[PDB]
Design an enzyme around this catalytic site. Structure first.
Site, mmCIF file in Angstrom:
data_model
loop_
_atom_site.group_PDB
_atom_site.id
_atom_site.type_symbol
_atom_site.label_atom_id
_atom_site.label_comp_id
_atom_site.label_asym_id
_atom_site.label_seq_id
_atom_site.Cartn_x
_atom_site.Cartn_y
_atom_site.Cartn_z
ATOM 1 N N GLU A 163 -48.046 -27.424 6.112
ATOM 2 C CA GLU A 163 -48.360 -28.374 5.201
ATOM 3 C C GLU A 163 -48.596 -29.555 5.605
ATOM 4 O O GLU A 163 -49.759 -30.437 5.447
ATOM 5 C CB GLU A 163 -47.454 -28.392 3.707
ATOM 6 C CG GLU A 163 -48.101 -29.217 2.602
ATOM 7 C CD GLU A 163 -46.889 -29.429 1.575
ATOM 8 O OE1 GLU A 163 -45.824 -29.705 1.767
ATOM 9 O OE2 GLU A 163 -47.412 -29.221 0.334
ATOM 10 N N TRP B 185 -49.560 -23.708 -2.824
ATOM 11 C CA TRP B 185 -50.725 -24.431 -3.535
ATOM 12 C C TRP B 185 -51.781 -23.466 -4.284
ATOM 13 O O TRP B 185 -52.624 -24.208 -4.951
ATOM 14 C CB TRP B 185 -51.444 -25.214 -2.591
ATOM 15 C CG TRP B 185 -50.622 -26.455 -2.344
ATOM 16 C CD1 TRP B 185 -50.001 -26.845 -1.022
ATOM 17 C CD2 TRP B 185 -50.601 -27.691 -3.150
ATOM 18 N NE1 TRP B 185 -49.741 -28.000 -1.220
ATOM 19 C CE2 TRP B 185 -49.893 -28.716 -2.172
ATOM 20 C CE3 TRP B 185 -50.966 -27.917 -4.488
ATOM 21 C CZ2 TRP B 185 -49.502 -29.916 -2.828
ATOM 22 C CZ3 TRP B 185 -50.780 -29.451 -4.953
ATOM 23 C CH2 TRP B 185 -49.745 -30.230 -4.181
ATOM 24 N N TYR C 241 -52.513 -35.887 -1.456
ATOM 25 C CA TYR C 241 -51.998 -36.295 -0.028
ATOM 26 C C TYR C 241 -52.650 -36.714 1.118
ATOM 27 O O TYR C 241 -52.931 -37.932 1.571
ATOM 28 C CB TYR C 241 -50.791 -35.477 0.266
ATOM 29 C CG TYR C 241 -49.626 -35.283 -0.793
ATOM 30 C CD1 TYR C 241 -48.876 -36.192 -1.386
ATOM 31 C CD2 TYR C 241 -50.022 -34.000 -1.624
ATOM 32 C CE1 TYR C 241 -48.158 -36.236 -2.326
ATOM 33 C CE2 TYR C 241 -49.006 -33.931 -2.504
ATOM 34 C CZ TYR C 241 -48.049 -34.853 -2.889
ATOM 35 O OH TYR C 241 -46.892 -34.484 -3.791
ATOM 36 N N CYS D 20 -46.206 -36.168 -5.800
ATOM 37 C CA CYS D 20 -44.731 -36.171 -6.414
ATOM 38 C C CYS D 20 -44.111 -37.019 -5.375
ATOM 39 O O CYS D 20 -43.432 -38.032 -5.607
ATOM 40 C CB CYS D 20 -44.162 -34.825 -6.340
ATOM 41 S SG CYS D 20 -44.988 -33.825 -7.771
ATOM 42 N N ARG E 142 -41.442 -39.719 -7.289
ATOM 43 C CA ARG E 142 -41.404 -39.749 -8.690
ATOM 44 C C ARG E 142 -40.898 -38.479 -9.708
ATOM 45 O O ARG E 142 -40.537 -38.618 -10.669
ATOM 46 C CB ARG E 142 -42.552 -40.063 -9.292
ATOM 47 C CG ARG E 142 -43.786 -38.984 -9.108
ATOM 48 C CD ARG E 142 -45.293 -39.065 -10.030
ATOM 49 N NE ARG E 142 -45.942 -38.134 -9.726
ATOM 50 C CZ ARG E 142 -45.844 -36.644 -10.330
ATOM 51 N NH1 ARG E 142 -45.180 -36.746 -11.707
ATOM 52 N NH2 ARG E 142 -46.591 -35.798 -9.846
ATOM 53 N N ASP F 4 -38.422 -31.362 -8.137
ATOM 54 C CA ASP F 4 -38.108 -30.096 -8.705
ATOM 55 C C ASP F 4 -36.771 -29.739 -7.664
ATOM 56 O O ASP F 4 -37.178 -29.206 -6.421
ATOM 57 C CB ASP F 4 -39.367 -29.208 -8.390
ATOM 58 C CG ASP F 4 -38.649 -27.750 -8.516
ATOM 59 O OD1 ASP F 4 -39.771 -26.808 -8.557
ATOM 60 O OD2 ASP F 4 -37.704 -27.192 -8.744
HETATM 61 C C1 LIG Z 1 -43.100 -26.829 -10.613
HETATM 62 C C2 LIG Z 1 -43.524 -26.948 -9.143
HETATM 63 N N1 LIG Z 1 -44.532 -27.006 -8.528
HETATM 64 C C3 LIG Z 1 -45.112 -27.253 -7.255
HETATM 65 C C4 LIG Z 1 -46.651 -27.299 -6.993
HETATM 66 C C5 LIG Z 1 -47.166 -27.505 -5.791
HETATM 67 C C6 LIG Z 1 -46.115 -27.941 -4.723
HETATM 68 C C7 LIG Z 1 -46.532 -28.242 -3.291
HETATM 69 C C8 LIG Z 1 -45.849 -28.376 -2.437
HETATM 70 C C9 LIG Z 1 -44.275 -28.234 -2.718
HETATM 71 C C10 LIG Z 1 -43.252 -28.697 -1.506
HETATM 72 N N2 LIG Z 1 -43.764 -27.959 -0.037
HETATM 73 C C11 LIG Z 1 -43.538 -26.736 0.450
HETATM 74 C C12 LIG Z 1 -44.138 -26.209 1.681
HETATM 75 C C13 LIG Z 1 -44.037 -24.779 2.214
HETATM 76 C C14 LIG Z 1 -43.435 -23.740 1.161
HETATM 77 C C15 LIG Z 1 -42.835 -24.412 -0.133
HETATM 78 C C16 LIG Z 1 -42.849 -25.436 -0.711
HETATM 79 C C17 LIG Z 1 -42.296 -23.204 -0.901
HETATM 80 N N3 LIG Z 1 -42.499 -21.953 0.141
HETATM 81 C C18 LIG Z 1 -42.037 -20.676 -0.623
HETATM 82 C C19 LIG Z 1 -43.158 -19.635 -1.102
HETATM 83 C C20 LIG Z 1 -44.338 -20.329 -1.861
HETATM 84 C C21 LIG Z 1 -44.598 -19.716 -3.060
HETATM 85 O O1 LIG Z 1 -43.668 -19.522 -4.119
HETATM 86 O O2 LIG Z 1 -45.690 -19.476 -3.433
HETATM 87 C C22 LIG Z 1 -40.817 -20.093 -0.017
HETATM 88 O O3 LIG Z 1 -39.854 -19.435 -0.429
HETATM 89 O O4 LIG Z 1 -40.592 -20.452 1.179
HETATM 90 C C23 LIG Z 1 -43.380 -22.461 1.511
HETATM 91 O O5 LIG Z 1 -43.938 -21.724 1.944
HETATM 92 C C24 LIG Z 1 -43.596 -28.037 -3.731
HETATM 93 C C25 LIG Z 1 -44.445 -27.666 -4.792
HETATM 94 C C26 LIG Z 1 -44.185 -27.573 -6.265
HETATM 95 C C27 LIG Z 1 -42.777 -27.537 -6.783
HETATM 96 O O6 LIG Z 1 -41.726 -27.682 -6.207
HETATM 97 N N4 LIG Z 1 -42.436 -27.201 -8.079
HETATM 98 O O1 LIG Z 2 -43.804 -31.838 -3.019
HETATM 99 C C1 LIG Z 2 -43.550 -31.580 -4.152
HETATM 100 C C2 LIG Z 2 -44.673 -31.507 -4.975
HETATM 101 C C3 LIG Z 2 -44.304 -31.098 -6.473
HETATM 102 N N1 LIG Z 2 -43.027 -31.275 -6.871
HETATM 103 C C4 LIG Z 2 -42.785 -30.610 -8.433
HETATM 104 C C5 LIG Z 2 -42.116 -31.832 -9.193
HETATM 105 C C6 LIG Z 2 -42.559 -31.135 -10.680
HETATM 106 O O2 LIG Z 2 -41.496 -30.186 -10.970
HETATM 107 C C7 LIG Z 2 -43.813 -30.510 -10.521
HETATM 108 C C8 LIG Z 2 -45.017 -31.578 -10.609
HETATM 109 O O3 LIG Z 2 -45.193 -31.917 -11.928
HETATM 110 P P1 LIG Z 2 -45.265 -33.352 -12.636
HETATM 111 O O4 LIG Z 2 -43.891 -34.206 -12.111
HETATM 112 O O5 LIG Z 2 -46.447 -33.753 -12.207
HETATM 113 O O6 LIG Z 2 -45.433 -32.954 -14.142
HETATM 114 O O7 LIG Z 2 -43.780 -30.050 -9.062
HETATM 115 C C9 LIG Z 2 -42.149 -31.309 -5.972
HETATM 116 O O8 LIG Z 2 -40.639 -31.270 -6.119
HETATM 117 N N2 LIG Z 2 -42.353 -31.366 -4.675
#
Ligand SMILES: Cc1nc2ccc3ccc(CNc4ccc5c(c4)CN([C@@H](CCC(=O)O)C(=O)O)C5=O)cc3c2c(=O)[nH]1
Ligand SMILES: O=c1ccn([C@H]2C[C@H](O)[C@@H](COP(=O)(O)O)O2)c(=O)[nH]1
Ligand SMILES: Cc1nc2ccc3ccc(CNc4ccc5c(c4)CN([C@@H](CCC(=O)O)C(=O)O)C5=O)cc3c2c(=O)[nH]1
Ligand SMILES: *c1cc(=O)[nH]c(=O)n1[C@H]1C[C@H](O)[C@@H](COP(=O)(O)O)O1
Lengths: 295, 295
Positions: free
Chosen positions: A63, A85, A111, A171, A197, A200
């Protein structure tokens, strides 16, 4: 260990004192605003990858590499088995926010695009934006090498003018780097303060911590500095109600020491890093805990 | 008091452990990166106006009102006998940063312009920008009154695309608002977390603390909320050398309790506040302390 405990203590704090609030995703969340920042020393090659839980580092690096290229096509990540994503880039989701003419996977000017072309007119995720907008990242590298004590080492993805075009507003909004004067007669340290901001805690935060610790390490490497501290500042710090159970079991676990990180190949340009240049040694986490994204 | 003590303890800590580092203004500074955020409670009408040194609150209010009108002409302030922006608007300074075609006093697309017209093409400080760019402030007020638990209540003046046009890049970069759920059955509270990339502890910080507490109280007032907490996050937190003298003693003065603030006349629109609408009571600070600016 103690550093990881900060995270675990924050999780417990939100469980026991977070406000119960309505979420846009329908799910419930327990939330706290402006908790004390988390701090991680990157000294001695230490790398802040959580141990009480398996953290898929590969996807974090992929990423980050994708952000650095200024890419905004989620299919580039999906092609590599990274699906975080996929939901926000889906036809269904896009239509729900009025982006009916956006091809699936085109997340908009998020980003990567802002880091490399802030201000440029966004078209789609297939267009070559070279030379358009301001390259904040290159500028930061150049400043570090030229006037390291500069107070304007900001990397920001928050662009109000483009929010409506994004599948998800940033975020992790911006970070500030700071180069420390030499302690004794050592190599200068590079520290980073991230402002997020919306955090999660169950799913995103562990990856975000790793993400910025890597970025800091990469820019330090390319600038001949040693990494100092990573400081994570949070706004709305929350836990999705359907993650509580799992976090409470993670909370019964004991943190092992963090692994170390070595940047191999002697990369000398931030744009030259590839997946295999990252050497994470001695990462021994507990099993993985399933925590579903709430879209 | 104990709240004012946070500030004082920070000033003293920088004096004793701050890194000595070269500055752009040529003067020297003691600096610390990412110190613990300062937190101020705005409940019971408490207004965090420092008592150990008289703070020009009229200048704070007028500058804020000027920001809100989306103004960028320092002469508007000068006409009201407020001079903090005169130096950065001078022909000499302007030319020193390459703005040779900029009329004296025209600060460029700084704070107020970004707050109300983010992304609009800046021409000069006398042009009518109505309807251009993103009105972040109006959007925040509307989101609070519509979907208060929104995690995107951000007010930012950080615009990389306009930095070169600004007489000075924003020090207080952005802030995030958060609406708490009602406690017991009282009106909901509105909190604000400010991120300041560079803080002149001696001169600017006290004014900025006052400035954002005011804005928080203003938005809350027009949204029928009560004010909650003001949290001040800092990046490069410094003290200018030619200020240490006048600060080591301020550290000898004991803090008195903070005054209170009442917003009356029932202003119901953010753009309708005027000086007399602010009623700061029981503000009784020590003598005023002269601290020179460093252009
Ligand atoms: C509600 C919510 N929505 C999101 C939407 C987009 C995101 C994009 C990036 C990140 C943070 N960056 C990464 C970068 C790589 C991985 C993961 C997160 C999670 N992940 C999972 C699998 C991904 C899946 O759930 O589809 C794993 O358990 O390893 C990765 O491969 C978090 C969100 C959230 C997030 O944390 N929460
Ligand atoms: O790198 C990232 C991208 C997103 N979020 C989480 C925060 C929120 O739970 C949700 C985004 O929703 P809003 O805050 O925009 O509603 O995804 C993260 O923690 N890390
Ligand atoms: C080195 C430096 N440069 C700056 C440049 C522009 C600024 C704009 C706003 C603020 C914060 N806001 C206010 C708002 C009102 C007043 C003052 C500051 C200072 N002040 C002076 C008078 C103005 C003067 O210094 O010329 C006083 O002592 O009463 C006020 O009237 C700080 C700076 C700094 C700052 O703190 N330090
Ligand atoms: C900037 C403006 C403000 O409202 N408050 C502040 O404290 N300052 C100070 C910070 C710094 O000393 C100087 C700006 O210098 P630089 O842009 O950080 O390089 O004014």
């Amino acid at each position: 260990n103690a550093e990881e405990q900060q995270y675990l203590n924050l999780v417990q704090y939100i469980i026991n004192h977070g406000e119960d609030r309505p979420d846009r995703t329908g799910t419930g969340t327990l939330s706290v605003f402006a908790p004390s920042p988390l701090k991680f020393s990157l000294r001695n090659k230490t790398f802040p990858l959580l141990t009480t839980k398996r953290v898929f580092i590969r996807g974090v690096i992929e990423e980050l590499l994708w952000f650095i290229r200024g890419e905004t096509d989620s299919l580039k990540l999906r092609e590599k088995n990274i699906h975080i994503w996929d939901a926000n880039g889906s036809r269904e989701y896009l239509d729900s926010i009025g982006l009916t003419k956006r091809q699936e996977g085109d997340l908009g000017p998020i980003y990567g695009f802002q880091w490399r072309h802030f201000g440029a007119e966004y078209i789609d995720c297939k267009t070559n934006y070279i030379g358009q907008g301001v390259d904040q990242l290159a500028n930061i590298i150049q400043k570090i090498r030229t006037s390291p004590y500069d107070r304007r080492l900001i990397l920001s993805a928050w662009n109000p003018a483009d929010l409506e075009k994004m599948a998800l507003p940033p975020c992790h909004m911006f970070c500030q780097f700071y180069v420390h004067i030499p302690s004794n007669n050592h190599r200068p340290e590079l520290s980073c303060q991230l402002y997020q901001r919306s955090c999660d805690m169950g799913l995103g935060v562990p990856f975000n911590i790793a993400s910025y610790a890597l970025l800091t390490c990469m820019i330090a490497h390319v600038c001949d500095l040693d990494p100092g501290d990573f400081i994570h500042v949070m706004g709305d710090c929350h836990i999705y109600k359907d993650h509580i159970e799992a976090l409470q079991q993670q909370l019964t676990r004991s943190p092992r020491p963090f692994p170390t990180l070595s940047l191999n190949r002697s990369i000398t340009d931030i744009e030259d890093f590839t997946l295999d240049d990252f050497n994470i040694q001695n990462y021994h986490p507990y099993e993985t805990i399933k925590m579903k994204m709430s879209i």
